[PDB]
Ligand binder design. Sequence first.
Ligand code: HEM
Length: 153
Amino acid sequence: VLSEGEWQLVLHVWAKVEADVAGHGQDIWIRLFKSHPETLEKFDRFKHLKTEAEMKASEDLKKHGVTVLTALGAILKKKGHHEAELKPLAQSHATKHKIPIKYLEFISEAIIHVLHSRHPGNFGADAQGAMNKALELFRKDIAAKYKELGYQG
Ligand code: HEM
């Protein structure tokens, strides 16, 4: 459970991300694909992208980034009361896409890295700790749902 103070640090930096959702989306996914090339294998629609240049020029990847960050933002804004939002997300990722928890750990790393690079003034040590906590909570709850749905993760 996060304190109100920790949620405030998370939503404060998220407000900055929302000024440019598409841009943040691209940076985060490209970071993920570059650092962990294996994750690209999960997208039959992006598995053909060979360079960062092709990734940055992909309209479909940009759209995916917006879809993902909008869903994550909705969850964070619930401040822990995200049961309803997580159910459909857990079902599609465990049953259809088959995304292991390890990959959610990788994207969490990418998110923290991008926020640190683009928002140093609003992402000091305390704020990073709060964001890490919020993302760990998200991963812990999705993991619990994965189990209930029959997917090891
Ligand atoms: C911050 C965590 C993430 C959030 C909130 C998120 C959210 C979403 C949403 C809302 C969709 C569209 C609806 C759906 O199919 O459920 C989606 C699709 C998908 N996600 Fe996730 N996702 C996350 C992380 C990941 C990761 C780490 C991977 C893979 C390494 C992944 C792979 C996919 C795939 C393969 C699709 C379908 C893409 C397509 O065929 O159009 N997701 N995700």
